[PDB]
Design a protein around this nucleic acid. Structure first.
Lengths: 368, 152, 255, 375
DNA sequence: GCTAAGCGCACCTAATTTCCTGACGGCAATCCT
RNA sequence: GUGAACCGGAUUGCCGUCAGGAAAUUAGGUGCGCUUAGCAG
């Protein structure tokens, strides 16, 4: 069972993702230029969201020695931590390591701070590194890491470390043609001079686009990554939905405060993943009546209708929920009165999704 | 054009991935003419028109984009006359035509003797058995055909 | 008789197949560089599908050491010029440190294209290794049709969720194996009044109409979204708007 | 807690912002051309305003040596101060540094004292200057706008180490987009020569570009981060918030205002308190088409009210209600008549609205936060 | 149930080329020795 | 079924977070749509 989240979101003039040159990320889809927001950007924005404060339990850092030393008021053990990390298979303050936070803190404190040998200490810390996957963040994003076999001692053996991701996020492509724009700026000098010129001259780049965002959560894999704690998986699904709905990429937000919420969310439950990106192969051209968001929602509804009347199996009918704030933007605005469970509240949508996965209530997670 | 192909083979078990790199000819067209007694050629064409097995262009992943039997068998005295008789069809009005036309022809032994010169290239593409796998060498000579010099 | 399946699938910006350097698999055709998904990639995408798991199983459909598997698949040739792109990425350290930036700061390669997929499965040999089980042969042909319709390569999919389904599938029963890659010798240039998928389907229709005018074929599009010829003349045998009835029509034509 | 200021304001025909070619700035929002006022321009207008004069102190200059000389008095040492800055990591081009330095104006005295002494060497003086500069973040404008400073590592003394020089920005300002199809107009001007002469022509012929639009401006202030940046000075943070509100309401960009006196006050200000930032820019994806039976500002306010109601009813229905204050001058333009309950209060005075915001924040009178002055 | 014609002007004069920022992080594979 | 039959480059990743094109301008000068008529035995 897959939880598919399709969102239609329009953003104010902003630069939420740029390359080395500072221009907003773009891609070609359907032969035309499209504005693009990278998948890992949305993944991190959901990751560091205010709604994931109760589920952020994994850390991706290269200065693990600093983290270990931080949990010691006076027990100065930092050179030993670096040495044991280096002998574990890292080589410099190292390569990126992804695993839990409290687990590594407690286990490193009880292992590497004890006066004992070295090689087996490296083995124990390696086992702790591999076995620290009890984090919803790792369960969603997944991880893998294989230390170099040259620097690592032959006395250190690694168990299986590949964590299969339960979340698939697509790159947010614009539903219409991309129009990059140049914002030419100056930097005023406060002290008057003999020239009366700016302290700096430059060109900023920004773009405003209606993005189609696609998320896909594998319920079975999310449960497997968290083992029998299925309630934790339900909480993770709900928190991910809330974060994706209410959190935006933290790009040049101080200069471009584009904090717009999506105008339509389609949560669909099927056993196979479907991307509705082909709904917008033809760029959406705005006309006198209606708007860009309305036309994008109409095109998406048309494509969903053709998909349902196309690839359809009577054995496992696909159900779905449509969300629009206070029913502002309907899906089947003109003829498609097929969705009988249109919702005009995000919390009601979360409750409906949780009920469909199982006997899960949003308040039921307040028991641990 | 080169293709990077990886084979997982069989996946007690271990990480054994075969390393391979294939070479492919991209945007190429060839014409193959075989000369023999008429009945065998007629039967060959008849069976080509009704292929009982999935035919390809050297590898199973290379299907024919044009019919193999598009050009029908005919009576032509020499291979040069057969090659020059068929006109060349231009894809569009103004495209760069190939001024050089490579060709491959079988080396005629003629009477007894007449050994192939040192300038004749060798080619090992005649199978007789694959245990041990051996291919008999063959001699290939190269010729030229140019349009616009014999037809006004 | 031969069953030939042609698909026109437009994919979202993704990295479905990769070389050693990380670039998307590429090809040259018509004087234009073109994106490519390898045939073995599509074949492996067909295998290991949960849709079928839920004679000798796993032997007749794919041989294992002859078997001489009857299903063949061509390389996915894009209809237009390949447009590779740079994905500049960094991996954050999300801790307060003396420096900034922690990841490999690489440059991922990706491209989006509308691929022409050619599948040719011969009924005779698939019957031959099925011991004459015509019903089972038709069942496995239908299962493979469903898989190829609703499966995608398991490439860099967690960051590029490209699960788009084909907008047009055409099944013909001609005697000789003809691939319609030459329909796209001229690369498709998108115009303001049309889209890439519609133009590609139109080029395929033009190629199908040509040569022959100077056999029959089933045309499937989801809910008849892209019609292969908007006329009442004898151009397409049946216009099918649903996949399951397309498989049914193929099945009772074969048997 | 976030302080969200949403503003609907119509401007007279003017050119408040322009690019290198002189045309008014434009953006493509919702697939249609709009009129844009950059966030930097609004930030500078608020910063260099009478209502924000008291909460100044941050100076962003490439001419730090001039300030050090002015503060030190008649003791020369300008060249030696410039060389100290040069060793610190600020290369000069001719007389000013190659990069801008943001710093509190209260530490110019410390810099002058550090330069003026003769007991200290050169590496020590550069290190002390760097320490003073990196620790000068107390100014309210530095707290609101933030700072980044990357000294030239190559042209720096080896024995000079920089501490953390970045301060988080507690203020987020969006570009002011228009609520309708922004059409630009070309003004054909001529320069007249007073001397008759014999040509009987004109001094100069040119083309001027201007546009009039109803702008939607969005501000976001992080209360906790503003308090942290000032090191727990809650009274100073409240004064900063109040003066920022008054400035954003009462000042406009000073671009071509001598010829285009576009000094129009906002026709409606919505102040909302929430834990997440929400922008109502999607209220105007449809460009507002003026109808005969209504007004452009009234139509924009109605569309904004509809979108605000939709967002409140579809995104913010939890156990924690969102409290918002709506201001119009003498209640000239209220919110949508179909609801009449969207805003918690409908204040008709700007000073009363500022007082209400200050009271709700933590409990603060305007008089007791204006009373913090040095004299 | 349906009246037409003549006539439509020239342009001198079009401002000011280095005011433009720095830094940190960039495999892990060695797929019959 | 001929360098061909068996054949995935598989996974981890926000550039983030500095910024007023501003101080100059009268399109100023010229002019008749104008000659014809019963909505009535």
């Amino acid at each position: 069972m897959l939880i598919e989240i399709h969102m239609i979101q329009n953003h104010s003039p902003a630069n939420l993702n740029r390359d080395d040159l500072g221009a907003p990320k773009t891609c070609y889809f359907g032969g035309v230029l499209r504005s693009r927001i990278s998948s890992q950007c949305i993944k991190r924005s959901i990751r560091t969201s205010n709604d994931f404060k109760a589920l952020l339990g994994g850390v991706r850092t290269r200065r693990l020695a600093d983290l270990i030393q931080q949990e010691a008021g006076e027990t100065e053990c930092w050179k030993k931590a670096q040495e044991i990390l280096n002998k574990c298979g890292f080589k410099n303050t190292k390569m990126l390591v992804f695993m839990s936070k409290d687990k590594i803190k407690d286990l490193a404190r009880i292992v590497l701070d004890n006066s004992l040998g070295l090689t087996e200490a490296a083995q124990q810390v390696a086992n702790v590194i591999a076995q620290a996957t009890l984090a919803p963040d790792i369960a969603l994003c997944g991880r893998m890491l294989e230390p170099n076999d040259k620097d690592k001692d032959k006395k250190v053996k690694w168990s299986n470390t590949t964590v299969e991701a339960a979340l698939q996020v697509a790159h947010a492509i614009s539903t219409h043609i991309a129009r990059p724009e140049i914002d030419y700026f100056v930097a005023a000098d406060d002290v008057p001079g003999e020239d009366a010129g700016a302290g700096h001259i430059g060109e900023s780049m920004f773009a405003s686009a209606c993005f189609y965002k696609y998320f896909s959560i594998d319920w079975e894999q999310l449960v497997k990554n968290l083992k029998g704690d299925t309630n934790l998986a339900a909480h993770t699904v709900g928190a991910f939905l809330l974060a994706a709905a209410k959190t935006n990429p933290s790009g040049k937000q101080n200069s471009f405060a584009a904090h717009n919420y999506p105008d339509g969310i389609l949560v669909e439950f099927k056993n196979s993943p479907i991307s509705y990106a082909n709904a917008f192969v033809r760029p959406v051209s705005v006309v006198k009546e209606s708007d860009l968001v309305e036309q994008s929602i109409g095109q998406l509804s048309n494509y969903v209708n053709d998909i349902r009347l196309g690839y359809y199996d009577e054995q496992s009918p696909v159900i779905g929920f449509w969300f629009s704030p206070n029913n502002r933007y309907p899906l089947g605005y003109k003829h498609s009165k097929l969705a009988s469970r249109n919702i005009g509240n995000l919390n009601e949508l979360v409750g409906a999704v949780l009920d469909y996965i199982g006997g899960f209530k949003w308040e039921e997670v307040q028991k641990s | 054009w080169w293709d990077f192909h990886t084979v997982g083979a069989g996946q007690k078990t271990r990480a054994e991935t075969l390393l391979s790199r294939r070479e492919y000819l991209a945007d190429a067209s060839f014409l193959v003419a075989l000369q023999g007694e008429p009945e065998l050629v007629a039967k060959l064409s008849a069976a080509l028109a009704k292929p009982v097995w999935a035919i390809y262009l050297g590898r199973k992943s290379c299907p024919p984009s044009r019919p193999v039997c598009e050009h029908p068998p005919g009576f032509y005295n020499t291979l040069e006359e057969a090659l020059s008789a068929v006109p060349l069809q231009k894809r569009w009005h103004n495209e760069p035509l190939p001024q050089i036309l490579p060709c491959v022809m079988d080396w005629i032994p003629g009477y007894d003797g007449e050994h192939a010169p040192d300038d004749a290239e060798i080619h090992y593409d005649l199978p007789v058995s694959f245990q041990p796998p051996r291919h008999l060498p063959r001699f290939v000579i190269r010729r030229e055909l140019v349009v616009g010099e014999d037809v006004q």
